[model samples]
Target chain A: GVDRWSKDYDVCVCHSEEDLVAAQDLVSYLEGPGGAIVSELCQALSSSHCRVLLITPGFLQDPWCKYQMLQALTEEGCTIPLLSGLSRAAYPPELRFMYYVDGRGPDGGFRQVKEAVMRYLQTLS
Target chain B: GVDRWSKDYDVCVCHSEEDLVAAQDLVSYLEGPGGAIVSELCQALSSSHCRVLLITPGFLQDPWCKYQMLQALTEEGCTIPLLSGLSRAAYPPELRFMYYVDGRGPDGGFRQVKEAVMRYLQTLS
Candidate 1:
């Protein structure tokens, strides 16, 4: 029953301008074995299976980020919160229930993210 | 479960700046008997149960409107496409399947809009 008609990308990475470097690193890692798109966050949201929000202080301050978060929450796809320069207490209240990947980990959070994505994809079949 | 936790408004009217007069008229009518909010389209989308997209040529030209439309489509709610100064073919491709309220009606589409909103509300209980 899962419809994948317009879902061209597997993952949509949402991030603020200040976190471009880390976002790029995550994108680079994800693009290695999975289809990942960055930027044009609003446009790509509905076309992706998973949405990754790079949460940081800068992301919280940006209005676009806030809108994107809300959009992601309401969307049917899975939302993965990647805490970069933020902590559990500072996580957006709307995404409190979903488990987040700690980007501050030893491997820069790439492994955990890949695992989460894989876990979500496995459910489709 | 139908969670109405943050749904403060029953309908969220989305319109282009050029269609403000018509939007206001619709909003005025809906506000009379139901909770309706206007503008800040992105922010108000998830907070409302039904989202009304006032479609027009000007709306298609606005990037924000496009984003809002996509947001509305992805949200877990009903979307009502109110065609204003546009034909059925001119409606957004993504929302073509949803039956739209023809705003070019004799009563300026108010009756149809109200009926549509009421019909959606009836399903809540």
Candidate 2:
């Protein structure tokens, strides 16, 4: 089977339905055409070497979605729990210690998202 | 760590928002009190030996939700693609050939769901 499509993306966006618009905006700003992958039944994230996670409140509530985050945190890549519109106290305690970024707003909080991705990537590289 | 609190559950319920009521009804009928786990960022599903997925139209539209189905289908004990409010054609073609079931209703299609769970468990046992 075809493993990975392109080596172009840096992270995957994981959010809930209410946050879909925000999720799309974030992906669009980051990758342009297919810059970032939105979490789903996707092979794209696994294919990419970097499986960074961008978390939002909606994502935190869905167990399956959270499982994706758990997979990212427990298995591979960077996991940044976004503080904006995110219910941090509800998050699993095991994941509480990770550095959270305040990335929100209709513009997708470009600055914080970029900084976190860059900082994490530096650690990995 | 406190892992797998009880052996009291049979399956985990996975669905989308449009099917939330249906998902809840199914879990309620099956478990009475915490008998089945509804897919969300739940520790219950992971802890349960049976991670049965209930597919619906809205679920098919969502990616991360589909990822949960894929995870159940690929890694777990059973993956019965329910044909209720589900848009089967919209489902990933990779999962096209598996035995799909006809399960729908406000009462949770109790008969079919129970049967499917039993059938899969039989093979596993």
Candidate 3:
């Protein structure tokens, strides 16, 4: 059996739960499925570590995030660790995970994950 | 033993890595390991899809990121799924997965993930 892990949340408050608001039924996609799960606590992380890991359809550049946090994380130098999961050797221990949703593009995390996964399979076979 | 599946990827263009760049010997997390795995292809995907599926330590708000893209995705209409994995099901079916990088906060995705996961075990045993 394949096991998938995710951390989902409804709202993100920069400070307290009060900073959070009830998610609109319409706004529900905030906690919707299919992608890797990040948390509202992300609001708490320092740019060095507060990057979210998602696996949705493709890319959406919200003037708010994308370049800022991601680039900031890099600038602040918080390391996203690359552990042994799905497959692949270690691609820059900082390189952790990624995906594409059009369901038709290259997987960003694939090089590392797949290789790890393939290696894991070799162990089984 | 648990098996996990992640759609992985490497590199993005925003259109190109000159626009995208090599997974910086430093950046790596842009395509690192333990997270949900979005795509470099994300650079091309619609703003609706490019959200990465990550499972890292905690929040780090890039002055640039955090609010905008997610809000942007919300502004746009794309549905994420909440499939069964690790012991939770259908928090929304929409909240497919999530994680807490701090690994200390409330497993925000727990309510849905745990409930659904218990249900999954029920099916198993």
Candidate 4:
């Protein structure tokens, strides 16, 4: 089911439980209306051309999140980090150079997140 | 299996993927070592004496989160909300009366969460 959805979107928008409401909206916007499917952990991580990780303090805290992080780290290409309350230091040094968004400020950091995702989306098109 | 484990613990700490690392520790402490079994989604929500939902900006975003929230609202007894980057205003008016924690400050808002859980635990005992 997830595999089918991955083909439609650019960024795989990996997120944690704390932001399901926002994540839902994020997946919708990232996928855009009329996209055939919604995002899923395994599918987004596996099939997509690019990756966007939404990092909260909670992102690193879940077992499933860790499980997925292993996959994100192993991916062959771009993996961007969208930050919120969480700091760049929270992630390993390897991901520091990837596109990042500090979600604490204006627009709740969605602008940068959208920008990064759009950059990735453009790559596929 | 969750029902078996629920019998051993007082508060079923409902948490998001963001804090799985912390939530794992929480379940261990709340359930205690040697108590047998770990946490699961529906099991924790169904059988426990109390419910402690760890809310983040993402909690309400996931489909599963909403599925669980519906159950939490329908449950027969005490339900607590542990707030982080999210807020009370974010939730519907019905949930405002339940126990709540603001997780933005010191200890990342864990003390108040712990205090609230323990308070509920006391009632069960």
Candidate 5:
């Protein structure tokens, strides 16, 4: 297998679906892209031990959001259970202008969350 | 200080919004009556590091859902960071007939979701 893209990370806990959103966002950053959201078969914030794709707010018209995040995000999607299809969503071409040039906090992350921008060119390769 | 009535539970990861629902349902059951759901402040199944209260779906007619949950659930609303107030909503009395007589996984929870049956009882108490 190619070098396992593993970074020791801790698991976060959430008390609600909204909380899940935030925690998952952080985890998604560490893992790649695609964070978990509230689910059907799951119920509350952390139920079925499954996962999901996260859509950060202020994502539109941002570069640091998903551009650098694409490949890793797509790969991350494969790691989680019952998740995928986040990339299939449509968005504007201008979204590609988004980028994550350094910075590792919430604000920096959201600054580039435009739709499929989180995916990578190598993904289709 | 009151006795910390604690129980052992496990944390689960979600791969989708639907998964969060399931994980949170069990936690809600073990937590009290209310469970966590999707929240804007949170996002992606987790984030913010805040907290939230959950509403089991079948919570509507399920007396078995909240009778033992009111106090615990209400207090849980207070224990988290930057959170509270899942109790001040509206609901019809007829929906309060659901219960958790035996169910434990998925279908057993959403059967009673209506509105605010969780806060009214002990909340008024």
Candidate 6:
């Protein structure tokens, strides 16, 4: 089994270029005062304990995003789906089995995102 | 550890819709003459021991292909890169570290693919 706590970053953010703004907002929230350190998607899966996927129509269309999500899944790492700019019905078929944070809802799902990450961290300790 | 020989299919081919005709050719070749049983990409990663990525420009553009490739990678399954309509330079960065069979070469790289699969099977026995 992997020692998740030994990883450098707490969370890795995966998103498409179109969703950069929203991804950045989430990144800032994760990296803000007393928050998790977020890393980029490229080859970062092995170095991060948790991976947050920012899913939207654009995200579904982008091959890189899909690749990152697949990598996260392949590594058996903790993956949190943050859905934005799309309805619940638009969630990806591959990720349908997993629960997601509804970014389209009120508060942009930031609170839920924090809670999910915190919960994952708690398990490591 | 996964029992590679216990899988139902020997190879899973990952390709784009544009490359379907070419993919079919390879599939027939694999399935026809005392060859491996090939499966489709969707959620088939766990059931197959080897994955053949039919890479091309069209493949790079397809999100689903990327997703499947990533899933194959995540599962730590054997992935064979078969470059058809693209140059060696165009090989995906993620797969560059691994060797590939160049379809653009003489014999369409089919013989090498067969040998690669055979070699993998040999190791199991």
lDDT of each: 0.68, 0.53, 0.27, 0.56, 0.29, 0.69
User: TM-score per candidate, in order?
Assistant: 0.47, 0.39, 0.18, 0.38, 0.16, 0.57
Chain B: TM-scores of all predictions: 0.76, 0.65, 0.23, 0.63, 0.23, 0.78
Share of reference contacts kept by candidate 1: 0.13
Tens digits of per-residue lDDT for model 2 on B1-125?
12233334446667777777776776666554222432321243354545546666677656666656645654444555566754445544444335565564434466676666655444432
Q: Is 2 or 5 the stronger prediction by DockQ? A: 2
Summing lDDT over every window of 10 consecutive residues in candidate 2 chain A, give the lowest-scoring window: A33-42
Interface Cα RMSD in Å, per prediction: 11.4, 11.1, 13.0, 17.7, 22.0, 5.5
The better candidate by TM-score, 4 or 5, is: 4
All models, DockQ values?
0.08, 0.03, 0.02, 0.01, 0.01, 0.19
Model 5, residue A118: C-alpha shift (Å)? 22
From the highest TM-score down, the ranking of the candidates is: 6, 1, 2, 4, 3, 5
Off by over 4 Å in 6: A1-48, A51-73, A79-116, A122-125, B1-5, B31-46
Q: Tens digits of per-residue lDDT for model 4 on B1-125?
A: 22323454456667667767666665655443233323333354356656767676677665465445545655326566666666656753334444456667456565665566555544442
- Model 6 residue A54 CA deviation (Å) reads 11
**Per-residue accuracy of model 6 over A40-81 as CA lDDT, tens digit each:** 542443467788888888987766666566556765357888
Tell me the lDDT of model 6 at B57.
88
Error of 6 at A93 (Å): 14
Cα lDDT tens digits for candidate 3, B1-125: 12222223322212112323322211233333333323343433433222332221111122122232233233212222212122332121213222211212244332332233233323321
Interface RMSD of candidate 4? 17.7
Model 5 clashing-pair count: 80
Top lDDT prediction, candidate number: 6
| Candidate 1 lDDT by residue in tens digits, A39-104 | 224244246778888888898877677666666777435888788777667665434445678877
**lDDT tens digits, residue span A1-125, model 2:** 22234344456666666777776666665564323433321243444434445566566555566656545554344556655565545543434334556554434455676566655544443
Instruction: Write out fnat for all predictions, comma-separated.
Output: 0.13, 0.00, 0.00, 0.00, 0.00, 0.26
Candidate 1 residue A28 Cα shift, in angstroms, is 0.6
Q: What does candidate 6's lDDT look like per residue over B12-102, in tens digits?
A: 6777888778777776776753344555542443466777888888977766766565555654247788888776666665454457888
DockQ leader: 6
